[PDB]
Each structure stands twice: as structure tokens, then as C-alpha cells.
């Protein structure tokens, strides 16, 4: 709690749905947004801050609250848009040999600034005396270790709590989330959304030699003709859907009522039957 990591993670496909099956978590509360809509929001960088507290101290981790740990080791203002994901770790962090490794900084002068890490080890000086280093009646160790033991009950066990602080500064967002895909359909007028490029057409196979850096592709006068497959390298062709003018041939409403229908721009295989120019 006095020395917590501040890993600045970015440039990844943060799939929050996977976190629901990695480890048997016991807390998945998120204050900012919903996890269903979180997978569709881009972010710049996530601040991963992890620490270990007891079971009765998990409630103190809130956007604004007082306590022995909420204002002395880690404080969250009223703007935390992440989560408070946490889980019990009483399976490998509790042995009967003396757990004098952790601490919680029982002694302090005042409330620390939220989202701040104070890595200090000086002797706590309770005023009215210059303590150049002494331990008696005026200046004591401001750190005190826990008493985690395996033969205990829930509530005073080591609980690993990790928060994911989100921020959106004046910089383009890097991490957005997981993106899915669908099966490719060839020789059929369907819709396509290849990397934002939306439209409809018949995805066919072409023989164009695209450049290794080019992704999209246009025509002589402002019309997309072929793009690059977002998957493995494949050269396709985007031709518009089936369209044409319909003309009806009628010999006149004086002898009969039989008419002929002519579809323009079709090879009789895309709608007796005759194929003309």
C-alpha cells in the first residue's frame, strides 16, 4: 500500500470480457461506466495500481472516503472512471513463518494527495522535539506489519486490490478494445465496413498489385474500387450492387395486353429470356 505499481499500459486490445474468466475475482464494481459499453470506448492510457489490504478494508476503497487506509496510503477523488477489481489471495500469500513483510503506515501527519505514492522510511516525528533518529517516548516507527495467518477467517486475509485509472488528455487514444470479424462472402452484393469504410457492393477477386503500405483504393473520379483485406493479404475488388433501368415494351392497349420487360445492365443471371447489348 505504501509502494504500489504505476504501470502505464497502452497500445493493446483491452478485452474486459476476458477478465471475467482469468481468476475467480470477488469484486468487479466499476464506478465510471458499464462493462458492456466499456469495450466500445477508446482510451489513451490506463494506470494500473495494485495493492494488498484486508477484507474489512476493501470497502474503504471508494471515490471519496476516510479511514486508516483510504486517506493514508491511497485516495481516490470523485472522478474515478475505472473499476475496483479485487480478489482474495489467501492461497499462496499466507504461511506460518512470520508475516513481517507488509505494512500500512499507521502513523501520518495529514491526509495525502489522492493518487500519490510516498515512499518514505523516516522516523515519525510528533513535533516539539528534534528527532535525529531515536525510538522512545517521542518518535516511533511509522510503519507496522500485518498479522496474516493461514488459520484465520475471512475479513482479515490478504486481498489483492487493483484499480484501473482512466484518463483522456489532449492526445489521441491508443487502447480501444476488442474488435470482431465475420466470414467473407464472394460474388454477392452485401454490405462492408472494412476499417470504417462503409458501403455495399459485390466483393470479387481481382488481380491488382497493391503496394505494401496502401490499404484503400479509389478510381479516376472519386469512387472506391478495391481495398485491402484487414486479415491476411488478399487482393479483392469492390463493384457496386445490382442496379439498372426497367423499360416496358407495350404494343398498345388496342389489340392485347401482353408486355415485355427489359432490364438494363444485366447478363440475365443477376436479376422467354434473351440477352442483348
Amino acid at each position, epitope marked *: 500500500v505504501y509502494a504500489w505499481n504505476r504501470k502505464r499500459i497502452s497500445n493493446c486490445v483491452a478485452d474486459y470480457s476476458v477478465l*471475467y*474468466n482469468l481468476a*475467480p*475475482f*470477488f*469484486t*468487479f*464494481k*466499476c464506478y465510471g461506466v*458499464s*462493462p*458492456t459499453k466499456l469495450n466500445d470506448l477508446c482510451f489513451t492510457n490506463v494506470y494500473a495500481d495494485s495493492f494488498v489490504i484486508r*477484507g*474489512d478494508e*476493501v*470497502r474503504q476503497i471508494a471515490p471519496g472516503q476516510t479511514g486508516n487506509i483510504a486517506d493514508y496510503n491511497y485516495k481516490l477523488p470523485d472522478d474515478f472512471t475505472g473499476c475496483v477489481i479485487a480478489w482474495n489471495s489467501n492461497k499462496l500469500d499466507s504461511k506460518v513463518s512470520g508475516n513481517y513483510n507488509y505494512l500500512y503506515r499507521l502513523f501520518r501527519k495529514s491526509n495525502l494527495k489522492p493518487f500519490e505514492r510516498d515512499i518514505s522510511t523516516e522516523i515519525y516525528q510528533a513535533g516539539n522535539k528534534p528527532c535525529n533518529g531515536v525510538a522512545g517516548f517521542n518518535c516511533y516507527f511509522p510503519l507496522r506489519s500485518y498479522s496474516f495467518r493461514p488459520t484465520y*477467517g*475471512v*475479513g482479515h486475509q490478504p486481498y489483492r486490490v487493483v484499480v484501473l485509472s482512466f484518463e483522456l488528455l489532449h492526445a489521441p487514444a491508443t487502447v480501444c478494445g476488442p474488435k470482431k470479424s465475420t466470414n467473407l462472402v464472394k460474388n454477392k452484393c452485401v454490405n462492408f465496413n472494412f476499417n470504417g469504410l462503409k458501403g455495399t457492393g459485390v466483393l470479387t477477386e481481382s488481380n491488382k498489385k497493391f503496394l505494401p503500405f496502401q490499404q484503400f483504393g479509389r478510381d479516376i473520379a472519386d469512387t472506391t474500387d478495391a481495398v485491402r483485406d484487414p486479415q491476411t493479404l488478399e487482393i479483392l475488388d469492390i463493384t457496386p450492387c445490382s442496379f439498372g433501368g426497367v423499360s416496358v415494351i407495350t404494343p398498345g392497349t388496342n389489340t392485347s395486353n401482353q408486355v415485355a420487360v427489359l432490364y438494363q445492365g444485366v447478363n440475365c443471371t443477376e436479376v422467354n429470356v434473351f440477352q442483348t447489348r
Partner: single-chain antibody
Amino acid sequence: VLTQPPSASGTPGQRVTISCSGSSSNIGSNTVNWYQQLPGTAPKLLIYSNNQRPSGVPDRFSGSKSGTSASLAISGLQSEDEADYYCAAWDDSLNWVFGGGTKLTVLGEVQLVESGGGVVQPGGSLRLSCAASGFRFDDHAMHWVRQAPGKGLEWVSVISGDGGSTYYADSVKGRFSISRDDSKNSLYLQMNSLRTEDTALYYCAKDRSYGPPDVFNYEYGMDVWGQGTTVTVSS
């Protein structure tokens, strides 16, 4: 509020799909809990946290949390699966909203017993007691989920294993006092301002978490139920 089919149907051999629709304030921020109750006997936990299942529940049940609604799946149902299915979720407004029940009918070891019912004079009431036998009452929470005869279930109050903060429902707030003691496994619930609309069973529900189900939004559940008494004030 949770939307659930009142009385669905189904045929043997194939599978059905029971759904539970809810807003993002209760389901979108927490986990749905599925409970199964046979007609006549005490209820029992079926699916908790929508991902894991108890040791007694076989692999014949499965649930998902796709979106803001829960979906139940029973691959290969039979006559033994003819029971009532209730959906439960903890809302962010310090309350526990329950479902209505799904009549999925197809026509082809620690005891948690409690007592303290009986008909009493309207206006006033008596205390509600409960007991157990060596189940580590300090490291477990207790819930009050009463069930009216023929009607559904609803959450009344909650007590944490630590014994500190407690929460009540929207109708039983103020006139109810729940607390524990340093004695053996027990639970005392005092009722006040009796309005005669309390004909239920008041199940002494056992849980597995330690704190109140407001900070632990992924481990909160409900263990095996207990045989409750039938209190009928009837004014």
C-alpha cells in the same frame, strides 16, 4: 425491477431459454443470481455469479450475462427440472430486487432451521429467531428472503459477517431491527409497525460472503436455505 416470464412452457428432450431483463443499474453493474425452488420444499442455489455453479448443481444448467440481461439454459431437461426459477440482483441503490418466478412446468451438512412465527395481535409483533449447528457464523452473512404462500420471494434485510453496517428494503426500513449476539449461531430480527401485510415464511437464508453485498459485487450469493416457520398474522 426485473422482467421475467411469469409462466413459460417447454417440451422434454430439447432445451429451453429463460431470460431476465433488467436495467444497467442492477444487472449492468452486478451479477445475476439464479435460484431453483421445488414446489413444497425449501429453495436452493442454482447458479451464482453467472459463471460458476455449486457442488450440488450438476452440469445440466448454464447461464450467461450477454448485455444487460441474463439468459438461462438447461441442456436436456427432464421431469426433475420442473421447478420455479427466480432472478436476483443487487441494485446500486442499496437494495436487493428479486424476480417473479418462471413456471417451467412440463407434463411429460448444516441445518438452517428457524422459528418464531405464530399468529399475533396486529400492530405489534414478536422477534424472529434462527439457529444453526457449527457453520462459522462469524465468517458468513445471513439474508431474510420471505415468501408469501403462492406468491414470489423478496429480500427483507441483510446482516454482514462482521456485524457492522446493515441494509433494509424499501418497505421494511426503520421499523425493523436486525442484530446478532456473541452467543452460539443465532439471528434475531425485531419487527415493528405491523400492517398485516406480512403473511410469509421469512427464510433464514445463509450466505457465503463476509461483508455486506455492496462492496463484493462478484462473490455475493446464497448458500443452502433452511426450513422456515409459517407466520400468518391475518390481522
